[PDB]
Amino acid sequence: QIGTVNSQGALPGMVWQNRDVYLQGPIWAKIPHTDGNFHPSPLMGGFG
Amino acid sequence: LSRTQTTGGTANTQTLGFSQGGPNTMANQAKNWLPGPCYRQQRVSTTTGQNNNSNFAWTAGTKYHLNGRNSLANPGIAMATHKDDEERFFPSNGILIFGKQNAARDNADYSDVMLTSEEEIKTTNPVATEEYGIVADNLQQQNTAPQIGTVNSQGALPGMVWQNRDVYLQGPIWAKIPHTDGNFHPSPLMGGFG
Amino acid sequence: ADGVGSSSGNWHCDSTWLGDRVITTSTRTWALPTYNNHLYKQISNGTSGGATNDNTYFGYSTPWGYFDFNRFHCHFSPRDWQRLINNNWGFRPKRLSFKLFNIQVKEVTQNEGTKTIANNLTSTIQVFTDSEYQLPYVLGSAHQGCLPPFPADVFMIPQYGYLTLNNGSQAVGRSSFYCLEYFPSQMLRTGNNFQFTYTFEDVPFHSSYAHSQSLDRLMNPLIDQYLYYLSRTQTTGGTANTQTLGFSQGGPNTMANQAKNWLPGPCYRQQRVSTTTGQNNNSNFAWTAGTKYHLNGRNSLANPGIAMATHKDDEERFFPSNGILIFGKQNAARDNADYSDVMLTSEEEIKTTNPVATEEYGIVADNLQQQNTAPQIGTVNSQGALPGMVWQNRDVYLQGPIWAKIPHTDGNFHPSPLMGGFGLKHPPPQILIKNTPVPADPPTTFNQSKLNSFITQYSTGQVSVEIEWELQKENSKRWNPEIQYTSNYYKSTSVDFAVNTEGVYSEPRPIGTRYLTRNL
Amino acid sequence: ADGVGSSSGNWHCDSTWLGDRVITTSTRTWALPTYNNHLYKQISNGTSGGATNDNTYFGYSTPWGYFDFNRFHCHFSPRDWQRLINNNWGFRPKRLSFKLFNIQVKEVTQNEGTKTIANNLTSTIQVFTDSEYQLPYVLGSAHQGCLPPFPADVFMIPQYGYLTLNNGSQAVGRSSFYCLEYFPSQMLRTGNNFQFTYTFEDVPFHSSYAHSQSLDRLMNPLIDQYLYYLSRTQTTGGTANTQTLGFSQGGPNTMANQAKNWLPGPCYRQQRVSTTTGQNNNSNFAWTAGTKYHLNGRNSLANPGIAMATHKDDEERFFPSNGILIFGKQNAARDNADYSDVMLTSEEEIKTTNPVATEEYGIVADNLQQQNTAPQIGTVNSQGALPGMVWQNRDVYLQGPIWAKIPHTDGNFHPSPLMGGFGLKHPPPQILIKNTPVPADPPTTFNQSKLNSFITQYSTGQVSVEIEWELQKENSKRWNPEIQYTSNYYKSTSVDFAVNTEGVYSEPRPIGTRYLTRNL
Amino acid sequence: KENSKRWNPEIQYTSNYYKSTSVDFAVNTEGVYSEPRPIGTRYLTRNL
Amino acid sequence: EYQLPYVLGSAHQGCLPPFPADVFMIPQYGYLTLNNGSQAVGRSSFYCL
Amino acid sequence: YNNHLYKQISNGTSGGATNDNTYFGYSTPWGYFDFNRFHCHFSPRDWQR
Amino acid sequence: VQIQESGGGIVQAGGSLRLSCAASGRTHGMYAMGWFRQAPGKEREFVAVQDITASNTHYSSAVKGRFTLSRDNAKNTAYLQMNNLKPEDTAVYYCAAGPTLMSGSYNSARDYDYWGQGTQVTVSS
């Protein structure tokens, strides 16, 4: 029997690209000040 | 928390009770670290009479899905090949397999190939053919009994530690890390130096 | 010089607050007994005795003992802990000193029923530090036997032991045996002393603060977004109600719908328990419903697990089953202690950035909808790291641990110890101590068997530890007053954090670090 | 300074691997008792008691004792021995240091039935080394009483004694008596220590390797020789078969016939015994069939004798009667121990260069043949050195001895000790130690008889020994992998070379040095 | 380099002692080189 | 460095000829290692030149 | 030699050789120079001198 | 590692009784061998103990001056001889063994690994 993976967190060996930026879109965001974060690139796009 | 119910003659009502972890309960003690990630593989025996009678290598295989294509995760992330005294079992697409000299290109017999074993990393890494663990499904209450669920794939959690796959004299040395915005622990999955 | 009649050190208990630094120093009196009658012993546990497979082990107990100061109340008085947590955004350890001095070896002889004790002036103790990390490191498991919180108490030194690989109760070829006499060691008579220094590696400040914002509230409440979201898939009208697409901008009245930059941290879901017992299911579910991980055929509880919020708003009666730290009250039983005998911590502050331990992380899509099939969703009960997650670590307590050793591995993810505190690749080294064996009179004809006939001995002395801590000052522009840790004003039979009529020191409650606030 | 309350040394157990050198250091705890009630005694054994003439002796036992570290497990842990034998073609000793420190003298008094023990702070011990080799040298006989292999064990010091010339149980005019108080000696109270250093003389490296060729196979297998051998003395034909001479060249199919440059080493033939007992003759032949030498009317077993191969191929169940070293397993009986209680070594590696201990060396001619008389041959059961012989020494073991003293004589031949190890003309000196006698109260009227009324005493302390060893690195171009010494992979109740549940250390098997290979 | 204080002996990779028709990691009668088994790197041990 | 089996010194054919005008063939190199019957043993060595 | 190959060679009792003549070894593609006889270096007149 | 009792019996007051004990294997064990007794409805009491070399020996106060403890390493056995018996010496005697002898702790039961089945000794007047 098999099962379907609908959400998957980071595995060793993954590679990915960030979302693209647009002329109408945002440039930067402030990285929240926290104990930990993972790949702090803002999800709407641009520079963390 | 060691006890949710009274142990007694008849009633057996709700209670809370607590114990310290010690030499005879190690499974219950508080710990600092977690085992590494898991992506579960199907188990195959080298004693063939123990396998299901059907051709499942592709249809039961462990796969990833990219742009409408299915590709086997071969060998995949580093996991222990089997647990103790289980050596006859291996993950379906989860190990490196070399050939013996003069082995055929297609449909070679088991006696013509050599199977590697990642058995050493069993200390830090989950076994490729079992679940990572158990979590809670629901909210229990006086009306509803508690339910659990099985974790067959688990990404990185804070506190995980793990080992990489081993390297072999017959095997590869390096790989090129793809040029991308992000990656996680770029150690090549067939083994060697990224 | 150092001799029988001179003391080799002084009593130092003090704290000094200087600028951005605080220095603590503690002295205690210890007693060390001979363990295992000077022997090494193989120890194991297996199913044959009736233990479950989950509890099996193989290892060795040693004649040695070790010093442990890995709890914060070793270094801080309750008032000092108040100074720290009310005034500072963070702190970390910098360096330490250790001293061992004023050593007394005593011999005890048994005759008939009477027991007598005398000095033995020529006996030694042996001491070494494992500076190269060549021994199994058993600090960082939260064991009993640290220096006592109260400086007048005299404590016993715990026995050193370790585990190696097992299969059931048997060992395997990879199992390791260690002899601790195989290291260099310093020998001390009653006039000698011992000391060393250590420097901590760079580590991030512990965050002692709560966030005053939540991750889903970071927007300006007065303004609309320029982005759009899908607000309507169906026409709202008199009768038909056909398919349509419609779109809206996110604004003050729909914050749940707005576009955001960040995600909450990871989740591994725990079962919920109430302190009002009539609300719990009637059954014994602590183990069978517990949250577990699975390693080499063994099941182990994830205890406490990853940092998650203990409960949501107005839920304080609920806690995760194995998901919190639980301390004991003084004179609490070892087994089956009642709820009134223990103290439950709460991680409630990190509720701003972290999911609550007893709920799902969220919802995803199961299927592909279409005209023929309605859409289906599914519940996410465990979620690993996603790009864009932020999270807080578990808090530290005055009763709790300070550091742990990061295991030596190819890879790790965010190596902050799950019981709390500072992860270190080169932690403070472990310190081993033993009484040197003294034979009882041998036979007068030679015999090759090892002598196992000894004079009973124990030793006592003083130990000092000094740690320097770096502080991170609070910079806030907040106008209104903060929450502070404070003692109660009202009258009571006893004083909190003092001795009682019988002389017994106790700690009334656990005290965390997070009082001051900071913007998210 | 050195006083009652300060320690005079530290515990050193370590090994350091540096380039071509390894340095071992060991520390143990010892107990020394008073021997012979402070007396010298004549000892002898003679036929009158019922001993055979072969066992008679005459000698003296002394009040003194001595230190002995002449076994390899004194200096090497089992893991260190593995590092040595898997990586190196040879090794030899270079220099040593010795220390004696932290000394405690105790007095024991007997009253009614109860026994009590106290310190005596003013008593001494005496220590000296015999650097000029003026005493009978009893090291090198493989006696019990060396430092223990396991560093946590406490050992008793053995009593010194020696033999001189005898006739039956009587002495002769040439017999020598020695008083050990007649040397200079150092006296130590509880604050004193003792040390010295020693340098080994040049000695050949022990060969730790087996040959990958055999002495009769050194030829090129593809080519003929240009020499000839007598291949035929008679015509091969229909009927007559008369005398003839015929000659052939040696080649690939006749290697037994080819001309060669070298001969196998010497032989002194041993009787063969099987570990499958039903294959042995039914009789008690251990002494009566034993291999012996004969000196001054006494018979002595040649045990182990000269180095010979233990068995040939596929013969492993056989061994020479007195021709091998045999160790005991832990708790093996002193007398009549069963085969399962002992461990038999095997010299099987030297089978390439050395004759097998249980076969003849070869064949020679007895007579002069002629037309009248057919030729006769004879079997060579013992063969001394011939020009052109080459041979290997016996191997060394982790449980076995290190050096022996070469007797001082006009001549010797290849002075390598037959039990194995390094022959030395100036070995490490023997170290003598004694408790100084303390009189009980004398009478108050003078009496000339020597005082023989003493206070019972014993002493304890620590001893350190440090040896530097030189290594010879392996240079091989062999393509395929070597044989290595390794631990077993499979699971077991206990770990090999560790303590058990009771605390007892044991050594499961003997371990030799020969794993790597080398061309002949 | 390996720094261990382990007292008992390690597992090592070793060739087999017993006799056989061919030598492992050599040529055969026909001249063909072969590799009998895969060989990993993990033999020595280390504390976790 | 004397790392190969040394097959000189067995008095084989194939040395330079005594008479200087003769032209000679070079002999083929080979060697032996340990055997048991026709089988090899674990100590047997293989060399690639 | 050997068409550029290394070859395992052996001889055993199975073929009918006696135990005294058994061997195991390898032949190589290489060859070697040998001047280990005195007539390589000396003419008969020189040997007389 | 079995300890085995022998020599049990019933005796009139003043007689000389002899208890014996044997073991099997681990002569690198059985370093210390001794005796305890538990009278009817009463606490187990240490009686005697002696080590391998016979250097160190201890007797209980009640026991002293009446019992003697001896040992034979060859047979791997130990004997207890008993003289001038009093009926309060009715008890169940256990042979007991351990790897070590300590000067402070020898009279505690915590220090013995192995225990026999026991013997019943009766003493009447």
Instruction: At A36, list the tokens.
Output: 């930990």
State the burial class of residue B163 (Cβ atoms within 10 Å of its Cβ: 0-12, 13-18, 19+): buried
Beta bridge partners of residue C327, listed in sequence order: C343
Determine whether the interchain pair B184/A11 forms a contact, defined as Cβ–Cβ distance below 8 Å: yes
Instruction: At C362, list the tokens.
Output: 């969220």
Amino acid making up residue C56: T
What kind and span of H or E run contains G46? helix G44-48
Residues C90, C207: contact at Cβ < 8 Å? yes
Residues C462, C101: contact at Cβ < 8 Å? yes
- Using an 8 Å CB-CB cutoff, list residues of chain F that contact chain D: 1-7, 9-14, 27-36, 42-48
Percent of residues in chain H assigned helix, strand, coil, to nearest 5: 5, 45, 50
Residues in chain H within 8 Å Cβ distance of C108: 103-104
Distance CA D170, CA C260 (A): 109
Distance CA C518, CA D117 (A): 69
Q: Position of tokens 């009633």?
A: B11
DSSP string, C133-156: --S---TTS--S-SPPSSTT-EEE
Count CA atoms closer than 13 A to H60's CA, side-chain side: 15
D222 → chain G, closest CA residue: G27
Residues in chain F within 8 Å Cβ distance of E17: 41-42
Say whether residue H110 is in contact with chain C using an 8 A CB cutoff: no
Give resolution, Å, one decimal: 2.3
Distance CA H25, CA H34 (A): 17
Residues B34, C413: contact at Cβ < 8 Å? no
Pairing of the two strands C263-264 and C389-391: parallel
- Determination approach: cryo-EM
The distance from CA D94 to its chain's CA centroid, rounded to whole angstroms, is 19
**CA B6, B8, B9: angle at the middle one, nearest 5?**
140
Q: Position of tokens 């919802």?
A: C363
Which of C38, C37, C57 is closest to C47 using CA atoms? Answer: C57
Residues D96, D67: contact at Cβ < 8 Å? no
Amino acid making up residue C278: G
Residues C381, B135: contact at Cβ < 8 Å? yes
Distance CA G19, CA F36 (A): 10
Distance CA C454, CA C442 (A): 10
Alpha carbon dihedral C223, C229, C234, C238, in 10-degree steps, equals 10
Whether a cis peptide bond, with omega within 30° of 0, leads into D304 is: yes
Which residues make Cβ contacts (< 8 Å) with residue D219, sequence separation at least 6? D225, D255, D258, D260, F7, F10, F12, F32
Residues B80, B132: contact at Cβ < 8 Å? no
Which residues make Cβ contacts (< 8 Å) with residue D373, sequence separation at least 6? D367
Strand order in the sheet with G7-11: F28-33, G23-31, G7-11
Q: How far apart are the first and last CA of chain F?
A: 14
List chains adjacent to chain A, taking adjacency as at least 3 C-beta pairs closer than 8 Å.
B, C
Residues D57, D166: contact at Cβ < 8 Å? yes
Residues C182, D151: contact at Cβ < 8 Å? yes
Q: Is D337 helix (H, G, I), strand (E, B) or coil?
A: coil
D82 → chain E, closest CA residue: E9
How many B-E residue pairs are in contact by the CB < 8 A criterion? Answer: 31
Beta bridge partners of residue D328, listed in sequence order: D342
Beta bridge partners of residue D456, listed in sequence order: none
B194 is in an annotated binding site: yes
Distance CA C360, CA C380 (A): 6
Distance CA E23, CA G7 (A): 12
Determine whether the interchain pair E47/C174 forms a contact, defined as Cβ–Cβ distance below 8 Å: no
Assign 3-class secondary structure to D478-520: CCCCCCCCCCCCCCECCCCCCECCCCCECCCCCCCCCCCEECC
Other beta carbons less than 10 A from residue D359's beta carbon: 17
Distance CA D463, CA D100 (A): 5
C458 → chain H, closest CA residue: H104
Which residue spans within C154-303 are E strands per DSSP?
Answer: 154-156, 159-164, 186-188, 194-199, 206-207, 210-211, 228-234, 243-249, 263-264, 267-268, 272-274, 292-295, 298-301
Q: How close is the nearest chain A Cα to the Cα of B98, in Å? A: 22
Instruction: At H49, list the tokens.
Output: 């103990």
Instruction: At C306, list the tokens.
Output: 């990853």
A37 → chain B, closest CA residue: B158
DSSP string, chain B: --EEE--SSS---EEEEE---BTTBSTTS--S-EE--EEPPPEEESSGGGS-SS--TTTT--EEEETTEEEE--S-S--BS--TT-TTEEESSSS-EEEPTT--SSS--GGGEEE---GGGGGTS-BTTS--EEEE-S---SSS---EEEESEE---TTEEE-PPP--TTS--B-PPP--SEEES---TTSSB-
Distance CA C323, CA C271 (A): 9
List chains adjacent to chain G, taking adjacency as at least 3 C-beta pairs closer than 8 Å.
D, E, F
Residues D9, D27: contact at Cβ < 8 Å? no
Other beta carbons less than 10 A from residue C136's beta carbon: 18
Count CA atoms closer than 13 A to C88's CA, side-chain side: 23
Tell which of F35, F36, F45, F47 to mutate to test the G interface (max G CBs under 10 Å).
Answer: F35
In total, chain E counts a number of residues equal to: 48
Instruction: At C299, list the tokens.
Output: 């099941």
DSSP H helical ranges for D250-361: none
Residues in chain G within 8 Å Cβ distance of D255: 20-21, 23
Which residues make Cβ contacts (< 8 Å) with residue C222, sequence separation at least 6? C252
Torsional sign, CA C489, C494, C499, C504? negative
Q: How far apart are the first and last CA of chain C?
A: 59
Determine whether the interchain pair D519/F4 forms a contact, defined as Cβ–Cβ distance below 8 Å: yes
**CA C200, C201, C206: angle at the middle one, nearest 5?**
85
Pairing of the two strands C210-211 and C517-518: parallel
Instruction: Give the phi and the psi of residue D151 in degrees, each rounded to 5.
Output: -70, -15
Nearest residue, CB atoms, E9 vs list D82, D481, D482: D82
Determine whether the interchain pair C336/B5 forms a contact, defined as Cβ–Cβ distance below 8 Å: no
Amino acid making up residue D64: W
- Using an 8 Å CB-CB cutoff, list residues of chain G that contact chain D: 9, 11, 17-18, 20-21, 23, 25, 27
Residues in chain G within 8 Å Cβ distance of F32: 23-25
Q: Is C53 helix (H, G, I), strand (E, B) or coil?
A: helix
Torsional sign, CA D263, D269, D275, D280? positive
Distance CA D480, CA F43 (A): 10
Distance CA C256, CA D267 (A): 98
Instruction: At D152, list the tokens.
Output: 């946590």
Determine whether the interchain pair C386/A9 forms a contact, defined as Cβ–Cβ distance below 8 Å: yes
D63 → chain C, closest CA residue: C444
Instruction: At C118, list the tokens.
Output: 């005398």
Instruction: At H80, list the tokens.
Output: 């207890």
In total, chain G counts a number of residues equal to: 49
φ/ψ bin of H76: left (φ > 0), alpha (ψ from -120 to 50), beta (otherwise): left
Residues C116, C108: contact at Cβ < 8 Å? yes
Nearest residue, CB atoms, B114 vs list E32, E33, E37: E37
C393 → chain A, closest CA residue: A35
Residues C317, C276: contact at Cβ < 8 Å? yes
Beta bridge partners of residue C341, listed in sequence order: none
Alpha carbon dihedral C507, C512, C517, C519, in 10-degree steps, equals 180
Distance CA C499, CA C483 (A): 28
Q: Is D128 helix (H, G, I), strand (E, B) or coil?
A: strand
Instruction: Give the phi and the psi of residue D260 in degrees, each rounded to 5.
Output: -135, 160
Count CA atoms closer than 13 A to D161's CA, side-chain side: 19
Residues F39, G24: contact at Cβ < 8 Å? yes
- Using an 8 Å CB-CB cutoff, list residues of chain G that contact chain F: 1-2, 6, 9-14, 19, 22-28, 30-37, 39-40
Determine whether the interchain pair C37/H102 forms a contact, defined as Cβ–Cβ distance below 8 Å: yes
Which of B51, B71, B47, B53 is closest to B61 using CA atoms? Answer: B71
Distance CA C265, CA C390 (A): 5
Distance CA H99, CA H34 (A): 12
Instruction: Give the phi and the psi of residue D49 in degrees, each rounded to 5.
Output: -70, -15
Determine whether the interchain pair E29/G7 forms a contact, defined as Cβ–Cβ distance below 8 Å: yes
Which residues make Cβ contacts (< 8 Å) with residue B16, sequence separation at least 6? B1, B3, B4, C273, C275, C277, C338, C339
Q: Position of tokens 């914060």?
A: C72
Instruction: At D354, list the tokens.
Output: 């050395």
Q: How far apart are the first and last CA of chain H?
A: 38
Torsional sign, CA C74, C75, C79, C84? negative
F48 → chain E, closest CA residue: E26
Nearest residue, CB atoms, C270 vs list B32, B136, B185: B136
Residues D116, C109: contact at Cβ < 8 Å? yes
Beta bridge partners of residue C343, listed in sequence order: C327
Distance CA D140, CA D162 (A): 13
Say whether residue H112 is in contact with chain D using an 8 A CB cutoff: no
Determine whether the interchain pair D483/E14 forms a contact, defined as Cβ–Cβ distance below 8 Å: yes
Other beta carbons less than 10 A from residue A10's beta carbon: 24
Strand order in the sheet with B3-5: B3-5, B14-18, C337-338
Distance CA D248, CA H3 (A): 77
Count CA atoms closer than 13 A to C95's CA, side-chain side: 6
Residues H31, H100: contact at Cβ < 8 Å? yes
Determine whether the interchain pair E38/B101 forms a contact, defined as Cβ–Cβ distance below 8 Å: no
Residues G6, E31: contact at Cβ < 8 Å? yes
Which residue spans within D87-174 are E strands per DSSP?
Answer: 88-111, 114-119, 125-129, 154-156, 159-164
Say whether residue H102 is in contact with chain C using an 8 A CB cutoff: yes
DSSP H helical ranges for C50-167: 78-87
State the burial class of residue C302 (Cβ atoms within 10 Å of its Cβ: 0-12, 13-18, 19+): buried
What kind and span of H or E run contains D465? strand D457-473
Which of B138, A43, B38, B129 is closest to C384 using CA atoms? Answer: B38
Residues C474, C516: contact at Cβ < 8 Å? yes
Assign 3-class secondary structure to C396-409: CCCCCECEEECCCC
List chains adjacent to chain E, taking adjacency as at least 3 C-beta pairs closer than 8 Å.
B, C, D, F, G
Instruction: At D222, list the tokens.
Output: 């593809």
Q: Is D425 helix (H, G, I), strand (E, B) or coil?
A: coil
Amino acid making up residue C72: F
State the burial class of residue B185 (Cβ atoms within 10 Å of its Cβ: 0-12, 13-18, 19+): buried
Which of C309, C67, C380, C352 is closest to C210 using CA atoms? Answer: C352
Nearest residue, CB atoms, F39 vs list E15, E21, E25: E21
E4 → chain C, closest CA residue: C134
Which of D204, D196, D207 is closest to D96 using CA atoms? Answer: D196
Instruction: At D516, list the tokens.
Output: 């790597």
Going by the DSSP 8-state scheme, the letter that residue C270 receives in this structure is: P
Determine whether the interchain pair C411/A29 forms a contact, defined as Cβ–Cβ distance below 8 Å: no
Determine whether the interchain pair B186/A9 forms a contact, defined as Cβ–Cβ distance below 8 Å: no
Instruction: At C484, list the tokens.
Output: 């502070």
Beta bridge partners of residue D80, listed in sequence order: none
Residues in chain D within 8 Å Cβ distance of H24: none
φ/ψ bin of C263: left (φ > 0), alpha (ψ from -120 to 50), beta (otherwise): beta
Amino acid making up residue C3: G
Residues in chain H within 8 Å Cβ distance of C34: 102
Amino acid making up residue C274: S
Q: How close is the nearest chain F Cα to the Cα of E5, in Å? A: 31
DSSP string, C81-114: HHHHHHHEEEEEEEEEEEEEEEEEEEEEEEETTE
Going by the DSSP 8-state scheme, the letter that residue D6 receives in this structure is: S
Q: How close is the nearest chain H Cα to the Cα of C34, in Å? A: 10
Helix then strand count (H, E) for chain E reads 0, 0
For the annotated binding site of C for AMP, the residues are: 416, 423
Distance CA E15, CA C495 (A): 73
E44 → chain B, closest CA residue: B120
Q: Position of tokens 């007396």?
A: D39
Q: Position of tokens 């070829």?
A: C173
